Amino acid sequence: EAVTTRAEALTIPAVLRARNLLSTTVARTPLVCDGTLPPFVPVAAPATMQTPFHRMLATADDLLFNGVACWALDRDESGTCIGAIHIPLDTWQIEENTVRVNGKAVDPMEVCIFVGIHGGLLTHASETFTDARNLVRAAARVAQNPAALIELRQTNNAQLSPDDVDRIINGYVAARRGRNSGVGFSSSGLEVHEHEMAKENLLIEGRNAAAVDVARAMNVPAAFIDATVQNAASRMIELVTFGVEPLMSAIEARLNQPDMHADHLANPLKFDPAALLDAIPTT
Amino acid sequence: LGEAVTTRAEALTIPAVLRARNLLSTTVARTPLVCDGTLPPFVPVAAPPGAATMQTPFHRMLATADDLLFNGVACWALDRDESGTCIGAIHIPLDTWQIEENTVRVNGKAVDPMEVCIFVGIHGGLLTHASETFTDARNLVRAAARVAQNPAALIELRQTNNAQLSPDDVDRIINGYVAARRGRNSGVGFSSSGLEVHEHEMAKENLLIEGRNAAAVDVARAMNVPAAFIDATVQNAASRMIELVTFGVEPLMSAIEARLNQPDMHADHLANPLKFDPAALLDAIPT
Amino acid sequence: AVTTRAEALTIPAVLRARNLLSTTVARTPLVCDGTLPPFVPVAAPPGAATMQTPFHRMLATADDLLFNGVACWALDRDESGTCIGAIHIPLDTWQIEENTVRVNGKAVDPMEVCIFVGIHGGLLTHASETFTDARNLVRAAARVAQNPAALIELRQTNNAQLSPDDVDRIINGYVAARRGRNSGVGFSSSGLEVHEHEMAKENLLIEGRNAAAVDVARAMNVPAAFIDATVGQNAASRMIELVTFGVEPLMSAIEARLNQPDMHADHLANPLKFDPAALLDAIPT
Amino acid sequence: EAVTTRAEALTIPAVLRARNLLSTTVARTPLVCDGTLPPFVPVAAPATMQTPFHRMLATADDLLFNGVACWALDRDESGTCIGAIHIPLDTWQIEENTVRVNGKAVDPMEVCIFVGIHGGLLTHASETFTDARNLVRAAARVAQNPAALIELRQTNNAQLSPDDVDRIINGYVAARRGRNSGVGFSSSGLEVHEHEMAKENLLIEGRNAAAVDVARAMNVPAAFIDATVQNAASRMIELVTFGVEPLMSAIEARLNQPDMHADHLANPLKFDPAALLDAIPTT
Amino acid sequence: LGEAVTTRAEALTIPAVLRARNLLSTTVARTPLVCDGTLPPFVPVAAPPGAATMQTPFHRMLATADDLLFNGVACWALDRDESGTCIGAIHIPLDTWQIEENTVRVNGKAVDPMEVCIFVGIHGGLLTHASETFTDARNLVRAAARVAQNPAALIELRQTNNAQLSPDDVDRIINGYVAARRGRNSGVGFSSSGLEVHEHEMAKENLLIEGRNAAAVDVARAMNVPAAFIDATVQNAASRMIELVTFGVEPLMSAIEARLNQPDMHADHLANPLKFDPAALLDAIPT
């Protein structure tokens, strides 16, 4: 019941909330340059269009969850890359040293692979995500059924077959699972005794702790996802400085390599977070 | 996993570790290396244009910060040309190099000292020092998962009666409870006559609640970051960054600088030393 | 008991305290009104794969002084007899038998080493109990959080005749279950009852943990707020705070040694000083 | 198990922390004078060198712990004292009126003895130090073994030899001391009963109280050693004014006597705490 | 010790006493004595250059403040030369002088009144007045040491059975518990059949906790210092010093001044009185 996939991760609201603060901001922020902007920047797909926004957003998710991302390049201008589109992770892999898209081995120059700032959440945060999800599930089982263990205790001296008891147990299971709105009959001398009574404060406290741990794994501060432990421009600056900016740096790094942007040394490509603050309306 | 936390992978599954790591290593990685003289070729170039090691200078530093933090040492494998001038350098993984006596071996083959640059950290690595506190940190979360719903570690089945019971009779009810405790039959078990279940070893919820936070602060401490930085409980971005840099990152940056400023790496270290530029991080912050 | 540095450094507060102290010394320049003594910029001579940088010499020296109260440099002297390089050497490689110093086996000329003397006899002597306590306290909480009972009693209720081995294996049953033998299910056989005694005091453990940490800070001459301990500012202030009370005592000890004729000829007129103001200049604006 | 020695005192972190705040500051602060500084000020040992820093530090510790300190003087200049080195306490003593170093009686002018501001901590603070140390030891015994007294209570009517019971007791001792992870077997009718259950709050509260009492004996304010009940320059001033300055006054007193500094009346020797504030870096 | 706290040595083993003492007596000692006229010879000179009483003027005042505080009186033995002008004065211990009728005796030998100067304090000495509160103060700490681990002062061994037991039988189990209570056998004792141990006289932890602080405040009160000054619970250095001087020390300084400003000690007291200069203490504080 582990959380091993993105789909599963995204069902944890903290994960989803952090992921948008992070991915969305990257996709929102433009790439910028002194001198001529590489043609792939404003153009993804010239069949199925993919907007530049979506290319970045997709890329930002890949790097976060899986630690790696691939663009498919259209280098036309003999040499230069004039478009790139994001392509899903299950659509490429790296064999020994070769790279293969759709199972067909590809020329290295057809492709741009990104490496992230670690191996990806699905590798490192699987445990914490699993805990965060489970905890909310624990609270729902136990809100009303606080005792994990129920004992049916015979006090008379009748000898009952295995089957007899299997039957006795079954009536109380139905009653728990809601039959007759939770009324059960203990037949003759039997007494129910509840054991392993849930520790309420630990579930409560643990829930926030889970939320803080998610914020941690995801590199956004806990206050940002309303986990308990400033104007818009302040928070965005804060979010960018400690949260988003490391993905941006990894992404710029790749992009500023000779295969993508041959004038990178003198005129490096850079994300422009300042653009986001300018979009903020003025009081 | 597992038992103790002894590998980097295990540790990074602890969110406070991963968060303390991101703050430390990514800052280092983002921070430009800078010189009043002409800048050394290796600084802008990690992997050369044509290879299957597309290591960027950012990932080179990042991996290095990590190596230093967890293992206490790091290696770059230098590309020296025929004049002996290092024109690029890549970080290589710890498991691919070593030192025997005075010999550096990379991939099992001894190598010229000069083909390599080895960095010594600020201690012996968190994998040596903080291994116990990481185990504790991770173990605490798992206990709370077990414990929250099943607080009592030990169940006793106690006979209160002289009732004749075969061992098979007992085996049977033990199994039914064992099934319950794994959650089959919706937690319901049966106690034959005169037999009573008693709960023992009830967990201390407060110990576990405080312990969790305490575990976090101890991770913060081992990793040389303030606990409020990882949201462990005890202003603007520019101040937070200065604080992080001043006490968290400068020791690592200082160590890296130290090594880079030796003559095999930067000959002109004395007149024009090669320094990280944290001011660059602040300029990047918008207003 | 915690008797070695290795063990000490597994206490997070010890590590944290030590980084702030030792690394801060290491980053601080030794500066001179005259021209610099040649050993200051040079520790290990030029070399090729790894070597002791001057930063690491100081770092290593700071630790030595802190944990053991003394530290040694192996001096490199020119034909004029002045130190033009100094390398920190590990403590398990030198001893001081008489007024005579030996490194590895051999006795050595006083002029080949520089021995520093710290501000006390070292945490490893003075703070061994606190370190031990701090460590054991964290381990206690880990045992205790799920097994709060210090003593379990298995009480025989009937008058069956048990044998030492009978008893012996019955305990083993419980030790087993306490390890998780049938989901921590044990069977109390109509003459047995399990009783828990000596329930752990959690507050005293929760408070004691913080108390331990504060004791560590005290021992290491750092404010408890710096290692994030609790007791019922901008980077610049903290550095100053950390330097004035935290680190200046070491620097002063190290300065005293360095300001001697074997090390620094012009010390009377132009003494060698650490320059903590450099640490503040480094802080971006 | 009393704390009667310095070594033992220095194992109490509060004692150690106070001692450095106190001794270290004195050693750090220079001696100063209008007109010519006595030659012994900058020079201790011209065999085993002792730095001036160490001379003061050593002296400051002696006066604090034992209330008394000795320098060994090298008066060369026929009359004047041109060097002094600190010498350990077990290296000198005062017989009836004579002073003896290493068992050999010495000329009074070979020696400079200091008297402190009281008889020394090892005399007055032995009890408090003993309590402070013990308290932490109490908490460690009792964290997990809160009951000081354990009773093994026979309920059957068997007559047991002294030896029998000696044996019974022994099994429970092992179990306490950790054998079988604290599982013990009470054989037949015996019941364990725990008595003298530790008073938790008193150990907790008492610990801080111990720390405050140490601060008290040592003449530093409790906040300074992080005991629970301002920029650098403020605290140093505060520390100097009420903490260090009394040792400094005792030390100046001796030094400003004719045997050491013959121009003391017009040009008295003085500690210069202001030097410490000047060393503080400027924001 | 002991029983009551009756000697100065016992009292000084109480940290609040020692701290209140240091603040009071050392301030007095550090504070210069000062005159608009020419300054009396005795002020700069306690012990002359050649003697085995190397008493400095600082220790002279210090000892005197102490004498006054604890015992209510102090003596200086004056060195008067043949003109009768006092050229130096040393403090001498209380046990070496006394007054019988109108005669002062030093070391058992009557002496000329003029060879001596005796100071009268502000009360009869804390050793008279505060003896009970010092006992209480010290006793409170010891109780908490006993009590913390062994809260119950009295153990009862109670027989619940008509069981025949020799006195020797009883003596035996009493001894085994007595051993336990001293900590032999790791606190474990044995109760023979029908015998039960019962705890009685459980200490009140709060009484002891509050009592401790209360004891401190009462020490503060007896010694004329504010409790926050000894960190007992209820700004800058210059203000703290003024406060201490104004209410704590000036009465003692005032008393000493009084005596010094009589004609046998300072003839010109009227025109140019001899005054302590607390301002000097403030000037010594750096900025």
CSV table of N, CA and C in Angstrom, one decimal, chain C residues 64-138:
chain,number,residue,atom,x,y,z
C,64,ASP,N,41.8,19.8,18.3
C,64,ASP,CA,42.7,19.1,19.2
C,64,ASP,C,42.7,19.9,20.5
C,65,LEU,N,42.7,21.2,20.4
C,65,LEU,CA,42.8,22.0,21.6
C,65,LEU,C,41.5,21.8,22.3
C,66,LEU,N,40.4,21.8,21.6
C,66,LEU,CA,39.2,21.6,22.3
C,66,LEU,C,38.9,20.3,22.9
C,67,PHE,N,39.2,19.2,22.2
C,67,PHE,CA,38.9,17.9,22.8
C,67,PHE,C,40.0,17.4,23.7
C,68,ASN,N,41.3,17.7,23.4
C,68,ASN,CA,42.4,17.2,24.2
C,68,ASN,C,43.2,18.2,24.9
C,69,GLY,N,43.0,19.5,24.7
C,69,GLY,CA,43.7,20.6,25.4
C,69,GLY,C,45.1,20.9,24.9
C,70,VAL,N,45.6,20.2,23.9
C,70,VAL,CA,46.9,20.4,23.3
C,70,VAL,C,46.9,20.0,21.9
C,71,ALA,N,47.9,20.5,21.1
C,71,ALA,CA,48.0,20.2,19.7
C,71,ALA,C,49.4,20.5,19.2
C,72,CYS,N,49.8,19.8,18.1
C,72,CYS,CA,51.1,19.9,17.6
C,72,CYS,C,51.2,20.1,16.1
C,73,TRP,N,52.2,20.9,15.7
C,73,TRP,CA,52.5,21.1,14.3
C,73,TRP,C,53.9,20.6,14.1
C,74,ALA,N,54.1,19.9,13.0
C,74,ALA,CA,55.5,19.6,12.6
C,74,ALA,C,56.0,20.7,11.7
C,75,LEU,N,57.1,21.3,12.2
C,75,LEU,CA,57.6,22.5,11.6
C,75,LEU,C,58.6,22.2,10.4
C,76,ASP,N,58.5,23.0,9.4
C,76,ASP,CA,59.5,23.0,8.3
C,76,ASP,C,60.4,24.3,8.5
C,77,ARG,N,61.7,24.1,8.7
C,77,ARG,CA,62.6,25.2,8.8
C,77,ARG,C,63.6,25.4,7.7
C,78,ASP,N,63.9,26.6,7.4
C,78,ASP,CA,64.9,26.9,6.3
C,78,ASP,C,66.3,26.8,7.0
C,79,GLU,N,67.3,26.9,6.1
C,79,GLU,CA,68.7,26.9,6.6
C,79,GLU,C,69.0,28.0,7.6
C,80,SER,N,68.3,29.1,7.5
C,80,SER,CA,68.4,30.2,8.5
C,80,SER,C,67.7,29.8,9.9
C,81,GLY,N,66.9,28.7,9.9
C,81,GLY,CA,66.2,28.3,11.1
C,81,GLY,C,64.9,29.0,11.4
C,82,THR,N,64.2,29.4,10.3
C,82,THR,CA,62.9,30.0,10.5
C,82,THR,C,61.8,29.1,9.9
C,83,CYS,N,60.7,29.0,10.5
C,83,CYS,CA,59.6,28.2,10.0
C,83,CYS,C,59.0,28.8,8.8
C,84,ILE,N,59.1,28.0,7.7
C,84,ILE,CA,58.5,28.4,6.5
C,84,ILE,C,57.3,27.5,6.0
C,85,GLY,N,57.0,26.5,6.9
C,85,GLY,CA,55.8,25.7,6.7
C,85,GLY,C,55.6,24.9,8.0
C,86,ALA,N,54.3,24.6,8.2
C,86,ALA,CA,53.9,23.8,9.4
C,86,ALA,C,52.7,23.0,9.0
C,87,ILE,N,52.7,21.7,9.5
C,87,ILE,CA,51.7,20.8,9.1
C,87,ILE,C,51.2,20.3,10.5
C,88,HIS,N,49.8,20.2,10.6
C,88,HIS,CA,49.3,19.6,11.8
C,88,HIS,C,49.4,18.1,11.7
C,89,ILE,N,49.8,17.5,12.8
C,89,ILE,CA,50.0,16.1,12.9
C,89,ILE,C,49.1,15.6,13.9
C,90,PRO,N,48.6,14.3,13.8
C,90,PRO,CA,47.6,13.7,14.7
C,90,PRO,C,48.2,13.3,16.0
C,91,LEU,N,47.3,13.3,17.0
C,91,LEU,CA,47.8,13.2,18.4
C,91,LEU,C,48.3,11.8,18.7
C,92,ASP,N,47.7,10.8,18.1
C,92,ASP,CA,48.2,9.5,18.3
C,92,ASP,C,49.6,9.3,17.6
C,93,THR,N,50.2,10.3,17.0
C,93,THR,CA,51.5,10.3,16.5
C,93,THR,C,52.6,11.0,17.2
C,94,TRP,N,52.2,11.7,18.3
C,94,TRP,CA,53.3,12.3,19.2
C,94,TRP,C,52.9,12.2,20.7
C,95,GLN,N,53.9,12.3,21.5
C,95,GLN,CA,53.7,12.2,23.0
C,95,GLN,C,54.9,13.0,23.5
C,96,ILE,N,54.7,13.4,24.8
C,96,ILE,CA,55.7,14.2,25.5
C,96,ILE,C,56.1,13.5,26.7
C,97,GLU,N,57.1,12.7,26.6
C,97,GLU,CA,57.6,11.8,27.7
C,97,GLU,C,58.3,12.5,28.8
C,98,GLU,N,59.3,13.3,28.6
C,98,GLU,CA,60.0,14.1,29.6
C,98,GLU,C,59.7,15.6,29.5
C,99,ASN,N,60.7,16.4,29.2
C,99,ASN,CA,60.5,17.7,28.5
C,99,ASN,C,60.9,17.4,27.0
C,100,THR,N,60.8,16.1,26.6
C,100,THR,CA,61.2,15.7,25.3
C,100,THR,C,60.0,15.1,24.5
C,101,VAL,N,60.0,15.4,23.2
C,101,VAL,CA,58.9,15.1,22.4
C,101,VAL,C,59.2,14.1,21.4
C,102,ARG,N,58.4,13.1,21.2
C,102,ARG,CA,58.7,12.1,20.2
C,102,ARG,C,57.5,11.9,19.3
C,103,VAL,N,57.8,11.9,18.0
C,103,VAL,CA,56.8,11.6,17.0
C,103,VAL,C,57.1,10.3,16.3
C,104,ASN,N,56.0,9.6,16.2
C,104,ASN,CA,56.1,8.2,15.9
C,104,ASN,C,57.1,7.7,17.0
C,105,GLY,N,58.0,6.8,16.7
C,105,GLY,CA,58.9,6.4,17.8
C,105,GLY,C,59.9,7.5,18.2
C,106,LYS,N,60.5,8.1,17.2
C,106,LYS,CA,61.7,8.8,17.5
C,106,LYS,C,61.6,10.1,18.3
C,107,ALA,N,62.6,10.3,19.1
C,107,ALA,CA,62.7,11.6,19.8
C,107,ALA,C,63.1,12.6,18.8
C,108,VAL,N,62.8,13.9,19.1
C,108,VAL,CA,62.9,14.9,18.1
C,108,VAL,C,63.3,16.2,18.7
C,109,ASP,N,63.9,17.0,17.9
C,109,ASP,CA,64.4,18.3,18.4
C,109,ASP,C,63.3,19.2,18.5
C,110,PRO,N,63.2,19.9,19.7
C,110,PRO,CA,62.2,20.9,20.0
C,110,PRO,C,61.9,21.9,18.9
C,111,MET,N,62.9,22.1,18.1
C,111,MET,CA,62.8,23.1,17.0
C,111,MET,C,62.0,22.4,15.9
C,112,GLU,N,61.6,21.2,15.9
C,112,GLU,CA,60.9,20.6,14.8
C,112,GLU,C,59.4,20.5,15.1
C,113,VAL,N,58.9,21.0,16.2
C,113,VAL,CA,57.5,20.9,16.5
C,113,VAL,C,57.1,22.2,17.1
C,114,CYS,N,55.8,22.5,17.0
C,114,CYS,CA,55.2,23.6,17.7
C,114,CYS,C,54.1,22.9,18.5
C,115,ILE,N,54.1,23.0,19.8
C,115,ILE,CA,53.1,22.4,20.7
C,115,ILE,C,52.2,23.5,21.2
C,116,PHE,N,50.9,23.4,21.0
C,116,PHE,CA,50.0,24.4,21.6
C,116,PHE,C,49.4,23.8,22.8
C,117,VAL,N,49.1,24.8,23.7
C,117,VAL,CA,48.4,24.5,24.9
C,117,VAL,C,47.1,25.2,24.9
C,118,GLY,N,46.0,24.6,25.3
C,118,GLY,CA,44.7,25.1,25.1
C,118,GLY,C,44.2,25.9,26.3
C,119,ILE,N,42.9,26.1,26.4
C,119,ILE,CA,42.3,26.8,27.6
C,119,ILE,C,41.9,25.9,28.7
C,120,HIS,N,42.1,24.6,28.5
C,120,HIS,CA,41.9,23.6,29.6
C,120,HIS,C,42.4,22.3,29.2
C,121,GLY,N,42.0,21.2,29.9
C,121,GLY,CA,42.6,19.9,29.7
C,121,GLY,C,41.9,19.1,28.6
C,122,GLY,N,40.8,19.7,28.0
C,122,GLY,CA,40.1,19.1,26.9
C,122,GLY,C,38.8,18.5,27.3
C,123,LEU,N,37.8,18.6,26.4
C,123,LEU,CA,36.5,18.1,26.7
C,123,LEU,C,36.5,16.6,27.0
C,124,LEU,N,37.4,15.9,26.3
C,124,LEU,CA,37.4,14.4,26.5
C,124,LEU,C,37.8,14.1,27.9
C,125,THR,N,38.5,15.0,28.7
C,125,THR,CA,38.7,14.7,30.1
C,125,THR,C,37.5,15.3,30.9
C,126,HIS,N,37.3,16.6,30.8
C,126,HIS,CA,36.2,17.2,31.6
C,126,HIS,C,34.8,16.9,31.2
C,127,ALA,N,34.5,16.7,30.0
C,127,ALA,CA,33.0,16.5,29.6
C,127,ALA,C,32.6,15.1,29.4
C,128,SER,N,33.4,14.1,29.8
C,128,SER,CA,33.1,12.7,29.5
C,128,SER,C,31.7,12.3,30.1
C,129,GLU,N,31.4,12.7,31.3
C,129,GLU,CA,30.2,12.3,31.9
C,129,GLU,C,29.0,12.9,31.2
C,130,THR,N,29.0,14.2,30.8
C,130,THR,CA,27.9,14.8,30.2
C,130,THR,C,27.7,14.2,28.8
C,131,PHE,N,28.8,13.9,28.1
C,131,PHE,CA,28.6,13.3,26.8
C,131,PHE,C,27.9,12.0,27.0
C,132,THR,N,28.4,11.2,28.0
C,132,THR,CA,27.8,9.9,28.2
C,132,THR,C,26.4,10.1,28.5
C,133,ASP,N,26.0,10.9,29.5
C,133,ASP,CA,24.6,11.2,29.8
C,133,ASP,C,23.8,11.7,28.6
C,134,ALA,N,24.3,12.5,27.8
C,134,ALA,CA,23.5,13.0,26.7
C,134,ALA,C,23.2,11.9,25.7
C,135,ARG,N,24.2,11.1,25.5
C,135,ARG,CA,24.0,10.0,24.6
C,135,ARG,C,23.0,9.0,25.2
C,136,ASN,N,23.2,8.6,26.4
C,136,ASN,CA,22.4,7.5,26.9
C,136,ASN,C,21.0,8.0,27.0
C,137,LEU,N,20.8,9.3,27.2
C,137,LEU,CA,19.5,9.8,27.4
C,137,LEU,C,18.7,9.6,26.1
C,138,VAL,N,19.2,9.9,25.0
C,138,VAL,CA,18.5,9.8,23.7
C,138,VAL,C,18.2,8.3,23.4
